[PDB]
C-alpha cells in the first residue's frame, strides 16, 4: 500500500506520503513518484492507492478545478473543494470503483488551514490529523501522543521524523523515502526526505 | 412549410438581432425597479402596476422575488417570462450547494442566467425572454453586489440603477444623490426619493412600491417590507427630503 | 515477452526478446515486439499479443493526425496519455497489456510506461513482461547513466539472455533497438549467447 | 398552372395535378450526356458518351460497374449518382454475404427505386435527379431505367436526354437487335446511335465514349482503348 | 434565400443552392497544379498585404497525407472543414488498409461531403451540413497508377486534370495552361510552367515572399514544400520574360 | 445499515420539548476511529432536525439532497417545511432509489407547529419504511442495545431539565455497552422558543 | 446448462513458403466433438488470384469470417479498380477480429498469396488478431504435431546446414507426408486434403485422400 | 423545421398572439370569483342554448381536489387539457409531500405550463383564464391565470365578457370583511342585473368552501334559497 | 428555427448571414494587442458611466489558461458562451495530452467553433471577432486573431473593434521588431487614435510574460497618458 500521513496545526498543514511506485507487486517500478496533485488555488491534494485510479481521478479532479477557478476570477474554497472531490468519489462509486484514498488540504483566509479526510467510499470529515492506507495503523498513534495544542512547524516535521522511523522499524514494507507538503504562511513547499 | 418562420434568430442588415431589441424595449413600457447598494446592505425598489383595488396588495407583491437566503432579484419586464427564470435561477442556487457543500455567490449566479438568455438568442428558433432583472446578493468574497442582466444577456454589475420605465429621469437622481458610503436608513430613503420623482408625484401613494434589503448580520437575513412599515419610510420622506 | 528500456547519456536504448506462447506450447518465434509510431517515438508490445498491438497501432492513428493539425512533433509525454486514457476506457473488459513508450520531445529523452488500466508511470530504467524482474536485475550492477554506445548495447544482449535463460514464457530471437537524436538505428537478432561457456557440459 | 406558388416544395401539388418539383429533377437528365444500352439475344452492350470539361481535362467516367455482372450508367447530377451507385453496390454485396446466391436483378432494381420514392414524400428530401441505366444478366439479359419518381421499365433500347429525339428514332426502327447474336454487329449498333445523336462540328469518338459489354459467360467487362478504336469505332 | 429552401430545383434542372454558390469559388488567391509523367507541381500565392501578418500561418497549399497534397479556393474557413475531414478519413484508411489512400478514392469522400442534404446513411448524420461548401479543391498526388490530380466543385463534379487553375485568376490561367502545357515533362519543365503561369496573372512579383509552391516526387512519394531556398532559385531563370 | 462507519441515533419526545442524540464517531473500518467530531444530526429548518445514521457515504450524500429540497421547497412557499411533508418526503426519497439504496437508518425530530406545538418523532429504515411514534424513538447500529434500554428509563411527559437527563443517561449506557460506537455524544434537546446544543464527556473507549 | 458456444470442428491447415511460392494444404473433415458430420468441407477459400485463407476453428466462425472478408474484399477491388496485396489484406482482417474483440472468432486463419513478382509471404495469427510475418505454419489441431515437422526443414538445428535447395517439386511431398503424419497421430485430421500452391501464375487446386480412421 | 414560436415579439414591444387570446376571453361567458372571511365563491353562468343538453354533464367548476376549485372562462377545449394537468400536479405534489398541495404551488406549476406554450415552437398559447381558489392553511386563496403566464392574487373578480363594468360592483359592493352567506348575495346580482340575459335560474353554478368543509358544489336546488332574494 | 439553414448562399456568392454578424462587430468595443520577442502587452478599450461599475466585472481581457490571454470585440453577451467553451477545451487537452494548450491549439478551436456556427441547422452566427495571445509549444508568443466567417491567422499587432482599419493602419507604420517592455505598451496606449477620448479610465492594458499575466496600475497608466498629449502638438 502507501502511508498518507496529513498533520493539521492551528496556522499550517503538513501532508507526507510515500514515493514507492508499486506495478507488478514483487517489485517496485520507480522511486520518487508523484502523488500530489497541486491545485493552483493553495489547496495541496493528496491521493493514495492504485496507480491507475489515482492519476484518472487527481487529472480530472484538478482540472475541473482549475476551469472553476479560471471561469470566475476567484479561487475555490477549501470547504467547497473538500465537498466537490467528496462528490466525484460517491458520483463515480456506482459505475467505477475508483479505489482511491484522499488527503484533502489546503487554506482559506476566512476559516483557517483546513485538513480533511476521505476514504474507499466517500467519507469526507474535517480532522487535525489523519493517515491512510495500510501503513495508518502504525501512524495514527504517534500522531495523538504529540498533538500538543498550538503546535508549529519546526515542531510538526520533528513528529513526522518521529513517526518515519517507525515505519522503517515495525512495518511490513518498510519504506524510506518521504514526501512532505509543508504548507507555512502561504508558501508551500516540498521538503522530501528520507530514513 | 417554412413560409411560417418569422426567423427569431436571424441578424438584421446594422447588424443588430431584432428580436433583442424588440424585447429590449419591451421591457422599457413595464414597471421601474430601483437598485442600489449601501454600506449596510443592498435594497431593491419596485412599482406595483396598478390594475385595480381588489388586489390584496398586504400579502405579497409580483415583483421582488427571492432566489435563496443570500440573493434576491427585482422583476422589471413581461411578467410571464420571469417566473419561468426565477425558477431556473432557484435550481442554479440550490444546484451550487448541492455540488460545493457552499453558498453561490451572486457574481456567478449571474452567468449561470445569463447564459439561459443568451441561448435562446443563439439556437433553438424561438423568441427571446423579454424580461431583466436587477439581481443582487451578499457573498463572502467581495461584500453586497447588484447586477442587472437583459435580454440578450449582457449583464453588468452596478451600485445603483433604475430599469423598467422612464430610466432616463430616474438615473439622473441616484447618478447625482447617491453617496460613496451610505447607512441603511439613509439608503432607503435615496431609493423612495427616486421613485416618486420616476412616476412624475411628490410622495407614494402607500399602496404603491415595495422594497426589501439583505444587510448581512453575519446570517444574511434578508427582511422584506410590510404595507405599515413603508409608512414609516414615506413619514421620513416627507419631512425632510 | 522480456522487455528493456535504457536512457542512456546518448538516447534510449529499447531491447526485446521474441518469443510467444500460448500456455504450454511456442506459437511462433518471429514476433516483433518493437512498435513504433514516429519517426522518433517507437512503442514497446508486451503482454497481450494482440491487446496491445491494436492500441499501438491505434495510437499511430491518433498520433499522425495531430501531426498534421498542428504540424508540430507530438511529445511522448502527449502520446502516453493519450494511450492510457484510451486503455482505461477497457479496464473492467478483459484485456492485458504492458507498453512502454518512448521517443525524443522537444524536451529531453522521455520514456513512460503505460499498463492496462492506465498506469503511466514515468522513469528511466522501466521493463515489463514475463521475465521481468531477471532483466531488471541484471540492469542494477551495470547502469551508470555515463557509458557508450558499443558497452551499452552488449548490456542490453547481457540482460535479456539471462532473463530468457531463467524464464520459460520468454525467449527466441532478441531484438535491440537504439533510439538516435533524429530516428532509431536497429540490431536484427542474435539467437543464442554463449556468455559463460567454453562447450565443456551444462551449467548449473 | 402556376410557376410561383406550387413551385417551392415536394409537398405542393399543381392545380392540373402534377408535381412541378419533380418535374424539375426529371429535367434534370436531359441535361447531361447520352448513353444508350442495346439488349440481344444473350448479350447487353452499353455506351456512354463521357464529357470534357476543357482540353486539358481527362473525360469524366460515366459507365460504373456495381457487380460482377450488373453495371449502370448515370445521367444527369454526378454527386447524387455516388449515392445509388454506392447503395447499389452495397446491395448485391450484402446478397453474397447473407445467401451465396447472386442478386435478383429484378429484386435490385425495385430497392434503388424505393429510394427514389423516399425521398419524394417528406419535405426537407429532394428528389434524386438522376436517371440510372441499369444493364445486367442474371438468368435472362435485362435492361432498366429509373425515374426521379419511382418506375421500372423494361426497355430493350434508350437514350437519354442529350439528343434522345434523335437516338431514339434510330431504336424504334430497329428490331433486329435481337436476332442479332454476334457481339461484334450489336456493338456497332450500339456505337452507331451515339454518331447518329452528336452534336455538329464535333469529334465523332476519339477514345472518349465508354463501352462495356455483360452477356451469357461475359462479366461487366470494360473495353479497354485498343479494342474499340481499332475496329469497332472505325468502321464508319 | 427568399422562402426557396436549400433543397429546391431550378425549372432548368439545377439546383438553386448550388448555383448560387459556386460563385463564390472565384474570390480567393489564385491557384495552379500541373501533373506530368514524372510528378505534380502545385502553386499558389502568398497575399500577405497587411504587413503585421506573420505570413507563416496562412498557407494556400495544405496537406491531407505524405501522399496527397493539395489546395484551396473560395471561403478560407470552409476549406479548412473538408480539409480536417479528409485529414482524418485518408488517415483512418491508413489504419484499415495499410496501404496509402488513391487520389481517385480521396477525392470521392470529399465529393460526398459537399452533398450533406439527401444522403441517408452513417458517418456524416452527427453533423449534417446545411450549407453546400463554397470551396473548390486542386487535391494531387502519388498514390499509384503514376501521379493523379483532382478538381472538386461544390456541385459535386470532381474532374481529373492534367493542369488545372482555381481562385480569382481561374479563367485568366486557363488560356495560358491550354496552350503551354506539354504531354512530356520533367520537374524543371513543369516548375518553370508553375511561375510563369503565375506571372501572367498577378498583381504583384513573383519574389520569394509572393509564391509558395510545393511539390510531391514519383520517387519518394513524399510532399516537401518549397523554402526559401528552392523558391529562389527557380523565380531567377525566368524562362519566357514577356511584357 | 453497516458495520462500517458505526453511529446511532435517538430522538425523545417531552412534554412540549424534544430531543435527539447521536455519536460523533467517524469510523475507517468496522473497528477503527479517525475522527471524533461526525456530527450525525443536521439542522434542517428552524424547528425540524433530522438524525441520519448508517454509512457515511449516504449521510452527507443525503444530506445534501435533502438540503437541496428543502431549500428549494422554502422559497417557493417563501415559509418554512413543516414536519409532516418533510417526513413524507423521506419516505419517498428513500424508496425512489430502492435497487440502489443509501445505508442510513434516518430519524426525524421536530415541532408539528398545528402557535401550537406537537413531538412528532419518527424513523425509517433502509428502504423507506415510515414509522410514526409519538414517544422515543431510535435508529442506528445500536437498535438492538437501544430498544429495551430506553423501555425502561421513559417517563410519559416530561419538562425541559428532566428530558436532558432521561437521554443522556439512555445513550450513554448504550455506547458504553456497543464497541463500533459511541466515542461521544451530542444532544441536541429543543423547545419552541430555544435550542440547546449539550456535548457529553462519554466513554473513550 | 449455460450453452458454451465455442466448438472446436477440428480440421488443420499448413503453410509453407520459399521464393515465388506458398502453399496451404488443409484436410476437409467437419466434425462435432467426437462424431463426424462430413468428409468435405473446404476449409481454404479463396479471395483473388494470388491469395487464399484457411482456417480451422468452428464452422460457424469461418463461413461467417469468409464471406465477411470476401465482401470487404469485393468492395475494395472497385472501389479502387486494383486488387490488393496480401500485404493489405492482413491488415484489414487484423481489425475485423478486433472489431469483435469481446465475442472472439474462434478460428484461427492463415493467409497465404504472393504481392511482387516473387515474394512468397505467408501470415498466421492466434483467434484475436496479432498477425506476424512467418515463413512457415500450421494451425487447427494437429497445430502442435506438425509444427515441429515443418520447423526441421525450414529452420534448422543440424550442424551442417544442408537442404540448400527448396523447389517446388520436392516441397510438395513434403506437405503431402506432414499430412499424412497428421492422419496418422491426430484424430481430427481429416482424409480429403486440397493442396494450393500459389506460383507467379494463378493458384493450383491438388488434391489428395489420407486415411479415413 | 416544425417547431419555431409563432407568439413572436412586436415593433410596438407585446406579444400580438397573446392580445389575440385575451379577446377570446373577453367574449365568452362571465365567470366570477369572490373570497370571504370563512370561505371562498366561485360562480359562474352557464349559457343554456337549449334544452337538451344536461345540466349535470357540462361544469365550468371542476375539482382541482378535495379543496381546490377551479373556475375557467374561454375555449372549453383548452379547459379539460388544462384539468388534466392540474389534477396530475396536485398528485405528483402529494405523492412526495404526504399534505394537501397548496394554491401557492399549484399555481405556480400551471403558471409555469400555460406560459410554455407561449414559448414552445408549434403552439399556440392558451385560449382561457382559470380562476383557482382553496382552502389553504395559510387562510383561503383566490388566483387567476392570465394566458399570457402571469398570476394576480385577486379577492374578488370576474375574468369573462364586460369584465371592466361588472368588475365595478366589487369595487364597491365589497369590504374587507364579509361572511360566507353575504358573498352569495352579491355574487348573483353580478350576473342578474349586470347582464340583460334572461331571469337567471338554474343557469348559475357556485363553488363554495364553507369554513375548511371539503369543496361543496351547489345544486340546482340549493342555489334557489340565494336566488329568490 | 430547428435545424434550418440560417446561414445560406446569396444569389452572388456572399455569406449574408455572416456579412450581417461581421458588421456587428463594427458596433463594438474596440481592442488591440502587439507581439514582442518574449511577451505580448494587450489593450482594449472600455467605457461605462461614472460613479458606478467600478471593477467592470472583466468585460474584455480574458485569461484562459496560466498563460493564455484573450481579448475580444463585438457581442459582449456573446463572449459569455464563447470563452466557456474555449475554456473548456483549454482543461480538455491539459487532461488528454498532458500538456498546457499552446495558443496553436486554441485559436484553431476557436476558429473551429465559430466555423461550425456558421455551417450547422438552426444557428446563429456568432458575431465576435476575439485576438489569441499565448504561448506556443515551446517558447514561442503568437498573437492570433479569429473574425467571426472562421478564418484566423498569426499576427505581428492587430486591433479590432470599432472602425479597425484606421487604428491598424497606425499600427502598420512605427511598429518595431523587438520592442522593449516600457517601449511597447507606449504604442500600444499610442492606439487612442480611435477613441476620441485622452482619460485613463476607459482603456486597459495588460502584459503577458513568465506564463503568468500581470495588469497595469492606474499610477504608471497616467503618467504614459501624460506623454500622448505633449506628443500631439
Not at chain 4, 430497392?111 to 419524394?120: C, F, G, L, R
Request: charged share 25%.
Amino acid at each position: 500500500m502507501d502511508t498518507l500521513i496529513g498533520l493539521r496545526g492551528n496556522n499550517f498543514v503538513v501532508l507526507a506520503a510515500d514515493t514507492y511506485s508499486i506495478n507488478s507487486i514483487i517489485k517496485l517500478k520507480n522511486d520518487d513518484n508523484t502523488k500530489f496533485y497541486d491545485i493552483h488555488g493553495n489547496k495541496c491534494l493528496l491521493l493514495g492507492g492504485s496507480i491507475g485510479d489515482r492519476l484518472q481521478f487527481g487529472e480530472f479532479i484538478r482540472k475541473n478545478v482549475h476551469l472553476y477557478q479560471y471561469q470566475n476570477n476567484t479561487d475555490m474554497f477549501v470547504k467547497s473543494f473538500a465537498f466537490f472531490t467528496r462528490k466525484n468519489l460517491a458520483y463515480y462509486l456506482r459505475r467505477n470503483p475508483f479505489e482511491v484514498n484522499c488527503l484533502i488540504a489546503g487554506y482559506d483566509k476566512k476559516d483557517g488551514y483546513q485538513l480533511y479526510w476521505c476514504d474507499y467510499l466517500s467519507n469526507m470529515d474535517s480532522v487535525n490529523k489523519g493517515a491512510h492506507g495500510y501503513g495508518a495503523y502504525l501512524v495514527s498513534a504517534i500522531l495523538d501522543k504529540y498533538y500538543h495544542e498550538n503546535l508549529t512547524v519546526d515542531e510538526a516535521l520533528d513528529i513526522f521524523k518521529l513517526c518515519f522511523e517507525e515505519l522503517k522499524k515495525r512495518f511490513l514494507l518498510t519504506q524510506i523515502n518521504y514526501e512532505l507538503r509543508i504548507m507555512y504562511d502561504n508558501k508551500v513547499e516540498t521538503q522530501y526526505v528520507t530514513v | 412549410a417554412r413560409r411560417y418562420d418569422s426567423r427569431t434568430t436571424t441578424f438584421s442588415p446594422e447588424g443588430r438581432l431584432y428580436q433583442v431589441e424588440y424585447a429590449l424595449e419591451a421591457i422599457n413600457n413595464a414597471s421601474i425597479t430601483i437598485g442600489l447598494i449601501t454600506k449596510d446592505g443592498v435594497i431593491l425598489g419596485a412599482d406595483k402596476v396598478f390594475i385595480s383595488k381588489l388586489i390584496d396588495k398586504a400579502n405579497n407583491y409580483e415583483k421582488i422575488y427571492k432566489i435563496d437566503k443570500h440573493i434576491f432579484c427585482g422583476v422589471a419586464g413581461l411578467n410571464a417570462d420571469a417566473n419561468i427564470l426565477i425558477n431556473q435561477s432557484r435550481l442554479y442556487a440550490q444546484r451550487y450547494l448541492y455540488n460545493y457543500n457552499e453558498v453561490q455567490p451572486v457574481s456567478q449566479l449571474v452567468v449561470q442566467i445569463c447564459d439561459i438568455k443568451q441561448s435562446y438568442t443563439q439556437y433553438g428558433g424561438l423568441r427571446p425572454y423579454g424580461v431583466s432583472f436587477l439581481i443582487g446578493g451578499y457573498d463572502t468574497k467581495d461584500g453586497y453586489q447588484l447586477y442587472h442582466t437583459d435580454p440578450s444577456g449582457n449583464y453588468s454589475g452596478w451600485f445603483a440603477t433604475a430599469i423598467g420605465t422612464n430610466n432616463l429621469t430616474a438615473s439622473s437622481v441616484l447618478k447625482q444623490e447617491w453617496k460613496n458610503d451610505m447607512t441603511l436608513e439613509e439608503g432607503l430613503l435615496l431609493a423612495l426619493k427616486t421613485l416618486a420623482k420616476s412616476t412624475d408625484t411628490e410622495i407614494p401613494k402607500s399602496e404603491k412600491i415595495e422594497l426589501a434589503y439583505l444587510t448581512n448580520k453575519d446570517g444574511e437575513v434578508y427582511q422584506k417590507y410590510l404595507t405599515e412599515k413603508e409608512i414609516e419610510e414615506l413619514i421620513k420622506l416627507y419631512t425632510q427630503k | 515477452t522480456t522487455t528493456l528500456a535504457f536512457k542512456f547519456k546518448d538516447g534510449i536504448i529499447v531491447a526485446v526478446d521474441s518469443r510467444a506462447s500460448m500456455g504450454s506450447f511456442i506459437s511462433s518465434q518471429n514476433v516483433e515486439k518493437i512498435i513504433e509510431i514516429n519517426k522518433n517515438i517507437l512503442g514497446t508490445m508486451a503482454g497481450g499479443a494482440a491487446d496491445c498491438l491494436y492500441w499501438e497501432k491505434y495510437l499511430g492513428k491518433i498520433i499522425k493526425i495531430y501531426e498534421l493539425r498542428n504540424n508540430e512533433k507530438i511529445s511522448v509525454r502527449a502520446a502516453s496519455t493519450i494511450l492510457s486514457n484510451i486503455l482505461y476506457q477497457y479496464k473492467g473488459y478483459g484485456l492485458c497489456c504492458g507498453i512502454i513508450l518512448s521517443g525524443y520531445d522537444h524536451t529531453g529523452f522521455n520514456m513512460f510506461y503505460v499498463d492496462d488500466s492506465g498506469k503511466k508511470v514515468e522513469g528511466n530504467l522501466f521493463s515489463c513482461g514475463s521475465g521481468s524482474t531477471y532483466a531488471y536485475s541484471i540492469l542494477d550492477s551495470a547502469y551508470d547513466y555515463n557509458l557508450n554506445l558499443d558497452q551499452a548495447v552488449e548490456l542490453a544482449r547481457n540482460a535479456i539472455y539471462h532473463a530468457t535463460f531463467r524464464d520459460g514464457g520468454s525467449g527466441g530471437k532478441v531484438r535491440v533497438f537504439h533510439i538516435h537524436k533524429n530516428g532509431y538505428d536497429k540490431i536484427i537478432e542474435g539467437e543464442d549467447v554463449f556468455d559463460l561457456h567454453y562447450h565443456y557440459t551444462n551449467p548449473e | 398552372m402556376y410557376r410561383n406558388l406550387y413551385d417551392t416544395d415536394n409537398i405542393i401539388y399543381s392545380p392540373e395535378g402534377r408535381l412541378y418539383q419533380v418535374e424539375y429533377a426529371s429535367e434534370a437528365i436531359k441535361q447531361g450526356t447520352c448513353a444508350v444500352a442495346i439488349k440481344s439475344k444473350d448479350y447487353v452492350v452499353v455506351s456512354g458518351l463521357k464529357k470534357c470539361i476543357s482540353k486539358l481535362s481527362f473525360p469524366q467516367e460515366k459507365i460504373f460497374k456495381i457487380d460482377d455482372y450488373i453495371g449502370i450508367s448515370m445521367s444527369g447530377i454526378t454527386s447524387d449518382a455516388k449515392v445509388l451507385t454506392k447503395f447499389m453496390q452495397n446491395e448485391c454485396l450484402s446478397h453474397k454475404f447473407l445467401y451465396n446466391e447472386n442478386i435478383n436483378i429484378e429484386s435490385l432494381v425495385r430497392s434503388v427505386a424505393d429510394k427514389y420514392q423516399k425521398n419524394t414524400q417528406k419535405s426537407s428530401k429532394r428528389a434524386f435527379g438522376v436517371g440510372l441505366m441499369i444493364a445486367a444478366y442474371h438468368n435472362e439479359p435485362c435492361i432498366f431505367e429509373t425515374r426521379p419518381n419511382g418506375s421500372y421499365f423494361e426497355y430493350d433500347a434508350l437514350s437519354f436526354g442529350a439528343r434522345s429525339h434523335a437516338s431514339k428514332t434510330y431504336l424504334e426502327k430497329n428490331l433486329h437487335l435481337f436476332e442479332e447474336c454476334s457481339l461484334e454487329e450489336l456493338i456497332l449498333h450500339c456505337l452507331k446511335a451515339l454518331k447518329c445523336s452528336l452534336s455538329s462540328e464535333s469529334e465523332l469518338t476519339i477514345s472518349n465514349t465508354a463501352l462495356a459489354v455483360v452477356g451469357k459467360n461475359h462479366p461487366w467487362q470494360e473495353i479497354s482503348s485498343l479494342q474499340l478504336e481499332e475496329y469497332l469505332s472505325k468502321v464508319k | 434565400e427568399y422562402d426557396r429552401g436549400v433543397n429546391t430545383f431550378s425549372p432548368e434542372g439545377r439546383l438553386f443552392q448550388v448555383e448560387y454558390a459556386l460563385g463564390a469559388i472565384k474570390l480567393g488567391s489564385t491557384a495552379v497544379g500541373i501533373c506530368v509523367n514524372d510528378g505534380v507541381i502545385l502553386a499558389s500565392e502568398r497575399r500577405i498585404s497587411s504587413t503585421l501578418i506573420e505570413k507563416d500561418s496562412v498557407e494556400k497549399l495544405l496537406s491531407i497525407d505524405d501522399h496527397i497534397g493539395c489546395a484551396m479556393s473560395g471561403l478560407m474557413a470552409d476549406a479548412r472543414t473538408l480539409i480536417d475531414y479528409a485529414r482524418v478519413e485518408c488517415n483512418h484508411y491508413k489504419f484499415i488498409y495499410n496501404e496509402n489512400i488513391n487520389i481517385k478514392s480521396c477525392v470521392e469522400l470529399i465529393s460526398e461531403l459537399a452533398l450533406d442534404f439527401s444522403n441517408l446513411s452513417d458517418s456524416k448524420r452527427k453533423k449534417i451540413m446545411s450549407r453546400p461548401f463554397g470551396v473548390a479543391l486542386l487535391i494531387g498526388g502519388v498514390d499509384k497508377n503514376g501521379p493523379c490530380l483532382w478538381y472538386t466543385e461544390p456541385s459535386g463534379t470532381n474532374t481529373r486534370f492534367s493542369a488545372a487553375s482555381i481562385g480569382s485568376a481561374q479563367e485568366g490561367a486557363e488560356l495560358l495552361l491550354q496552350e503551354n502545357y506539354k504531354k512530356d515533362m520533367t520537374f524543371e519543365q513543369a516548375e518553370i510552367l508553375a511561375l510563369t503561369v503565375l506571372r501572367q496573372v498577378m498583381e504583384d512579383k513573383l519574389s520569394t515572399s509572393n509564391v509558395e509552391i510545393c511539390a510531391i516526387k514519383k520517387s519518394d512519394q513524399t510532399f516537401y514544400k518549397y523554402n526559401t531556398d528552392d523558391i529562389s532559385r527557380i523565380i531567377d531563370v525566368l524562362p519566357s520574360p514577356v511584357y | 445499515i453497516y458495520n462500517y462507519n458505526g453511529g446511532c441515533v435517538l430522538g425523545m419526545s417531552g412534554s412540549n420539548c424534544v430531543a435527539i442524540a447521536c455519536d460523533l464517531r467517524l469510523g475507517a473500518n468496522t473497528f477503527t476511529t479517525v475522527s471524533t467530531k461526525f456530527s450525525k444530526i443536521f439542522k434542517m429548518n428552524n424547528n425540524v432536525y433530522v438524525g441520519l445514521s448508517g454509512l457515511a457515504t449516504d449521510i452527507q450524500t443525503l444530506y445534501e439532497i435533502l438540503r437541496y429540497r428543502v431549500n428549494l421547497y422554502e422559497v417557493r412557499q417563501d415559509a418554512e417545511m413543516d414536519v409532516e411533508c418533510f417526513a413524507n418526503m423521506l419516505s419517498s426519497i428513500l424508496y425512489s432509489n430502492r435497487f440502489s439504496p443509501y445505508f442510513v437508518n434516518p430519524i426525524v425530530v421536530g415541532f408539528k407547529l398545528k402557535v401550537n406545538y406537537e413531538p412528532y418523532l419518527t424513523a425509517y429504515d433502509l428502504i423507506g419504511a415510515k414509522c410514526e411514534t409519538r414517544d422515543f424513538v431510535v435508529n442506528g447500529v445500536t437498535s438492538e442495545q437501544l430498544f429495551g434500554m430506553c423501555e425502561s428509563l421513559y417517563v410519559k411527559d416530561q419538562d425541559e431539565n428532566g428530558l436532558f437527563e432521561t437521554i443522556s443517561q439512555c445513550l450513554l449506557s448504550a455506547l458504553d455497552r456497543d464497541c463500533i460506537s459511541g466515542w461521544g455524544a451530542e444532544v441536541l434537546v429543543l423547545t419552541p422558543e430555544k435550542i440547546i446544543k449539550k456535548k457529553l464527556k462519554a466513554r473513550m473507549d | 446448462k449455460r450453452w458454451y458456444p465455442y466448438i472446436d470442428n477440428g480440421g488443420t491447415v499448413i503453410g509453407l513458403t520459399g521464393k515465388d511460392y506458398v502453399i496451404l494444404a488443409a484436410d476437409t473433415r467437419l466434425s462435432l466433438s467426437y462424431s463426424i458430420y462430413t468428409r468435405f468441407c473446404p476449409k481454404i477459400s479463396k479471395l483473388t488470384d494470388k491469395c487464399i485463407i484457411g482456417s480451422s476453428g468452428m464452422q460457424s466462425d469461418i463461413k461467417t469470417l469468409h464471406s465477411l472478408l470476401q465482401k470487404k474484399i469485393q468492395l475494395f477491388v472497385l472501389e479502387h479498380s486494383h486488387y490488393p496485396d496480401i500485404h493489405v489484406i492482413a491488415r484489414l482482417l487484423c481489425v475485423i477480429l478486433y472489431s469483435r474483440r469481446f465475442f472472439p472468432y474462434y478460428a484461427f486463419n492463415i493467409l497465404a498469396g504472393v504481392d511482387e513478382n516473387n515474394k512468397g509471404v505467408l501470415y498466421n495469427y492466434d483467434s484475436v488478431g496479432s498477425y506476424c510475418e512467418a515463413t512457415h505454419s500450421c494451425v487447427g489441431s494437429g497445430s502442435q504435431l506438425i509444427l515441429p515437422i515443418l520447423d526441421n526443414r525450414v529452420e534448422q538445428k543440424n550442424q551442417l546446414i544442408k537442404n540448400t535447395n527448396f523447389n517446388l517439386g520436392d516441397d510438395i511431398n513434403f506437405v503431402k507426408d506432414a499430412i499424412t503424419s497428421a492422419t496418422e497421430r491426430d484424430i481430427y485430421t481429416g482424409d480429403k486434403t486440397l493442396i494450393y500452391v500459389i506460383d507467379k501464375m494463378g493458384i493450383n487446386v491438388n488434391t489428395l485422400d489420407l486415411k479415413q480412421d | 423545421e416544425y417547431s419555431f414560436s409563432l407568439t413572436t415579439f412586436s415593433p410596438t414591444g407585446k406579444l400580438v398572439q397573446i392580445e389575440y387570446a385575451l379577446n377570446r376571453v373577453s367574449s365568452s361567458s362571465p365567470a366570477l370569483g369572490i373570497r370571504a372571511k370563512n370561505g371562498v365563491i366561485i360562480a359562474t353562468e352557464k349559457k343554456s342554448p337549449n334544452e337538451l343538453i344536461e345540466e349535470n354533464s357540462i361544469f365550468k367548476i371542476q375539482q382541482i381536489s378535495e379543496h381546490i376549485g377551479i373556475v375557467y372562462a374561454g375555449m372549453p377545449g383548452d379547459f379539460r387539457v388544462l384539468l388534466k394537468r392540474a389534477r396530475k400536479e396536485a398528485i405528483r405534489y402529494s405523492l412526495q409531500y404526504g399534505s394537501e398541495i397548496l394554491v401557492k404551488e399549484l399555481v405556480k406549476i400551471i403558471a409555469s405550463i400555460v406560459q410554455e406554450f407561449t414559448q414552445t415552437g408549434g403552439v399556440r398559447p392558451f385560449g382561457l383564464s382559470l380562476l383557482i381558489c382553496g382552502v389553504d392553511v395559510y387562510g383561503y386563496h383566490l388566483y387567476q391565470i392570465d394566458p399570457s403566464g402571469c398570476y394576480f392574487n385577486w379577492m374578488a373578480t370576474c375574468v369573462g365578457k364586460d369584465y371592466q363594468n361588472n368588475m365595478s360592483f366589487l369595487e364597491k359592493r365589497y369590504n374587507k370583511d364579509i361572511e360566507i352567506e353575504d358573498a352569495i348575495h352579491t355574487a348573483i346580482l353580478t350576473l342578474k342585473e349586470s347582464y340583460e340575459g334572461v331571469l337567471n335560474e338554474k343557469n348559475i353554478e357556485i363553488g363554495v368552501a364553507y369554513d375548511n368543509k371539503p369543496f361543496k358544489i351547489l345544486t340546482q336546488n340549493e342555489i334557489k334559497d340565494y336566488l329568490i332574494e | 428555427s430547428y435545424d434550418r439553414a440560417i446561414t445560406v448562399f446569396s444569389p452572388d456568392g456572399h455569406l449574408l448571414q455572416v456579412e450581417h454578424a461581421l458588421e456587428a462587430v463594427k458596433k463594438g468595443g474596440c481592442a488591440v494587442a502587439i507581439k514582442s520577442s518574449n511577451f505580448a502587452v494587450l489593450a482594449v478599450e472600455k467605457k461605462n458611466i461614472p460613479k458606478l461599475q467600478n471593477p467592470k466585472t472583466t468585460e474584455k481581457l480574458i485569461k484562459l489558461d496560466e498563460h493564455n490571454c484573450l481579448a475580444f470585440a463585438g457581442l459582449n453577451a456573446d463572449a459569455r458562451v464563447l470563452v466557456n467553451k474555449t475554456r473548456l477545451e483549454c482543461q480538455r487537452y491539459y487532461l488528454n495530452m498532458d500538456e498546457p494548450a499552446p495558443v496553436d491549439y486554441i485559436a484553431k478551436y476557436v476558429a473551429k467553433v465559430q466555423q461550425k456556427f456558421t455551417h450547422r441547422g438552426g444557428v446563429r452566427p456568432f458575431g465576435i471577432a476575439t485576438l489569441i495571445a499565448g504561448f506556443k509549444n515551446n517558447k514561442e508568443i503568437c498573437i492570433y486573431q479569429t473574425e467571426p466567417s472562421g478564418i484566423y491567422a498569426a499576427w505581428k499587432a492587430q486591433a479590432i473593434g470599432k472602425n479597425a482599419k484606421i487604428v491598424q493602419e497606425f499600427l502598420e507604420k512605427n511598429y518595431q521588431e523587438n520592442m522593449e517592455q516600457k517601449d511597447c505598451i507606449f504604442l500600444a496606449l499610442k492606439a487612442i487614435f480611435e477613441v476620441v477620448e485622452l482619460s485613463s479610465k476607459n482603456v486597459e492594458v495588460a502584459l503577458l510574460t513568465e506564463k503568468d499575466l500581470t495588469f497595469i496600475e492606474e499610477q504608471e497608466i497616467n503618467s504614459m497618458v501624460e506623454l500622448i498629449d505633449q506628443e500631439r502638438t
